[PDB]
Symmetry: D2
Subunit: 315 residues, 4 copies
């Protein structure tokens, strides 16, 4: 008796309803699982919204809770795949496999990667080995953690990378594992989608030579409840920007120091800025867009900067 | 006989210039070195005025017959931006090397001593002539054009998608690739003709992003905006209208990305650049693309010329 | 208060010395005693109660199986002591990976074991060993390191002793794993991101207490126009297993397959590894009919790693099916 | 209006076939002829005037020196023809990197030569060969490819044939260079970022037109507890050079040095490479006294690459100092 896998489609070039086309076009899935599909949205992923994430997250929770669902696959555009994957990893309190998957090459193109990617995603979602591992991403014959995998290379099929390595590989339908997650996720998370009805607004500003405070102030004036600073180096802040950040913090905007140095390492508390004195937070190893996701989720529960720091150290 | 190398210090934790030099007595074996303190900043705080001053000084020194090569000691946070700028604007074949250290020189196992030795070694080497600006960290010879700070904390921080061009070991340089892109002597740009740098700013793309940062940055003076998009410089549907509006208002729109380990942003792929009169940044990360756009806008505001530039440099 | 950490010195560049500070590459390995190595890092005393022993003083390219056993037995004796909280081995980098894996297989302890070396001698400008040794002692003293298997702490990284390997020459980032670092160590603090998945230490079926002498295992290389000569000669001179370092997915030339069949028939185990070592793994029954031939694939393990696992496994079994299970579990 | 490109087929996974679409890894190589390869990509007509020839039909792990010569001589004949603008070779991935370096050394032409394979057979879901082949033909037809040396065009990359290696098993990103890709090929279009520094093709001192049969060169591996047995056996059975695939910086065990000294004195060249293949290079006089012993270091070249260069080099010289020059220039 094969596993029952539900594919929740959101758009992207992997659809080459989109979900019906996939289920019709990859008849090999039937070898490895009983598939059914639902079109949760039809979007280019760069245009995803928080309302989209909530709808998706709620749906995945409903399915996870059903006795007739064994694993879930989410098909997605590649641009913000990493953000959805981390979101789900924080809010879905389930041990059932959840896999997110896309295609780097346009789905109808010569040698396009999506077909095998989707076959692998359904394989992984149907595998007992996937239970309790958090959200997974299955691109380039790899099993990557949805927490810290990122789109790192443009164009190429090897696009999705993590500083901490792949956890496994998927080959001819079989999963081979080499590492386990360390960080908090899914059933061991403090967050639960079932209790989240809205998400706070979080925005991201970049650091670079000759940067001013303008983007920071403007983003806050248009509703940001936290600012993810994408700094140079070790979350460094220009001396022209620090005063604004102090003022914004006082005004109640959380200040989270991430970086655009995203192949490896992490941002160290109290190294480049006096985070304790200013009541700021460091994003640890998390890239800016990952940091935004964590901040948003966390701020559904707490606005205590020390708790936020704990969170950024545990997830 | 030894090369005449000048060390231009600008700051960073590799750090005065006289201390740096005194800290590596071994420099004397490989070159005749002199020092000048151009500035003393944390490189995250660098300004365009600082870049202009450094660039002009490097050109003045490169014109001297008493100078064979130039090492610039720098904070690592915007090293990559400085190195690229110099690669664009200095029309000299003399070696120009930019160097820093990921650990403080007071730290255990600090990397700066040997970095600085190697920079001086590369700056004195005939093989370095005509190679464009070089960066010499982690025993590598990296191109200033496309090396970037990619790993935090670790001494292997500076990486290029196109690989190291060479290595430096026990003072000797070993080359394996050559640059392909326009630089230094073959640049159309010259610091000696630049007295002003146009304001260029950068905005980030992510889920649920709005047009707010872009509009605000333009309102506060940006002549070009570098879009650090998701994926292949992709732009949210919520942002496209503002970008069109800002282009008609005269702001150049340059599509870069935060996908920085390899590949490049393809024209007309994710957005209709010809129709909108936008530019793609090719392989250049956002902070690199800013540098190029600012230099290029000293000379042209033609988006087609700008695109050429982004495909040649 | 402070952890009691023992440093077992074995040689290497970390104990090396060059003629000048510029000699980061041309120098003499394995010159300095352990007490001198401890004295070069006064800061160790802040983070642990340390003491040293000189187990051996070798250039690691010249290590022997007897040296592995010696080291492995002393580590066991220390791990069984109430007075020892963690152990650091200083080692040459050339075969560091082989030793670290060996210890991960045979040391049935959850006490931290850390193997460390350096790419530059301590005499050199910007020498890396001071910080490497500090970080080693930090990791060895940290409760987070318990039950994690053998660790390697070079270049600010916590790597698994299983699958870290020397991958880059000259540079201080020399040690890499296909599956990533598991963590980092920065201002002596350990930050974890991944856990091991493979069997090690406490959960291993193997124990250095049982091993009296290791079986002879040798390695032969695959390349264009390769013949069966090296395989045959190595078996004629005592190899009980051959590790084939093939091209591609452990591929075997048609010129070589017949010899390997005959060797297997004559009781020599035949293990297919590769010289394609940045990622992936060797898949059973893909390039060659391993079930027909009664051969074993080395999975992700590089040739020199495969050799260590082969030797440890052959102390318990001569059944190729079991050997394959072992190559899939460890 | 279109460039004339000749495809020379030699076998490989690119020409392979498995039983079902999901057989991406377990299949038969070297089953399809060139005509069918070309038929599988009708889009080639858009970009070039292509003709195909079947040179051989092999799994590339079983390649011989005879086969390289045969291929190299056919490539030369085509290069000399006015009716040929560029050349593509389809090849198994396992020794692709050996062939591509060989060709880089011996083909005295600026006309583009591209070597290409695939990691999955054409029958597989998401098979990589079609686009690889398309992109090879595009690069072979591009004026920007002239004078660049032999190129390899897999995974949307333009890699130098000198120093690209098969580094990752299973995945389509198999081929890597320590020195980076030189460019990318996308929508048929080539995008260059680096140029070669090393000697190649028209600037080579070697020429396939002079080579009648290649010297025998073999490879032996370094690891813990290694002996001199492989080196001596290989030499006894005809090796005119030995490639030492050392640990670390081409390091040699003290149990092996005496045999290598004896062999060099008996006329066998001794080349120190390594199995540390992601970066760096082997430094002369560092780990061994090369000048004293009259040995050669392979610089950054991996063992199988060093074997190729040594074979070519030895068609011209037996002077170890000239061989060292060659290892420093090519
Ligand atoms: N921007 C598109 C690209 C196509 C794709 O990756 O699916 C997306 O993210 O939806
Ligand atoms: N943020 C400091 C760090 C110190 C350094 O890298 O030198 C700078 O870039 O100047
Ligand atoms: N080959 C020597 C020195 C190399 C090193 O330790 O880095 C050894 O492995 O002991
Ligand atoms: N081992 C075969 C198939 C592997 C491949 O081509 O990818 C060969 O090298 O010909």
């Amino acid at each position: 008796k094969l596993a029952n896998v539900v594919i929740l489609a959101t758009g992207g070039t992997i659809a080459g309803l989109g979900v019906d086309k996939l289920i019709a076009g990859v008849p090999e899935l039937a070898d490895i699982a009983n598939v059914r599909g639902e079109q949760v949205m039809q979007i280019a992923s760069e245009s995803i919204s928080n309302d989209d994430l909530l709808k998706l997250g709620k749906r995945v929770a409903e399915l996870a809770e059903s006795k007739d669902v064994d694993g879930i696959v989410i098909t997605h555009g590649t641009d913000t795949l990493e953000e959805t994957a981390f979101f789900l990893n924080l809010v879905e309190k389930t041990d059932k496999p959840i896999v997110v998957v896309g295609s780097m090459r346009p789905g109808t193109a010569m040698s396009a990667d999506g077909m095998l990617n989707l076959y692998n995603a359904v394989a992984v979602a149907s595998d007992k080995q996937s239970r309790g591992k958090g959200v997974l991403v299955t691109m380039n014959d790899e099993i990557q953690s949805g927490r810290d995998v990122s789109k790192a290379v443009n164009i190429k099929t090897e696009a999705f990378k993590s500083a901490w390595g792949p956890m496994g590989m998927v080959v001819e339908g079989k999963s081979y594992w080499f590492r386990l997650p360390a960080k908090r996720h899914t059933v061991n998370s403090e967050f639960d989608i079932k209790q989240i009805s809205s998400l706070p607004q979080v925005d991201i500003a970049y650091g670079y030579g000759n940067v001013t405070d303008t983007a920071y102030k403007a983003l806050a004036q248009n509703g940001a409840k936290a600012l993810i600073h994408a700094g140079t180096g070790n979350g460094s802040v220009s001396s022209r920007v620090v005063p604004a950040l102090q003022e914004l913090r006082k005004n109640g905007v959380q200040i989270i120091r991430s970086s655009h140095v995203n192949q490896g390492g992490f941002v160290l508390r109290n190294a480049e800025q006096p985070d304790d004195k200013n009541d700021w937070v460091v994003a640890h190893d998390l890239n800016p867009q990952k940091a935004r996701i964590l901040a948003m989720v966390a701020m559904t529960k707490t606005q205590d900067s020390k708790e936020l720091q704990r969170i950024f150290w545990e997830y």
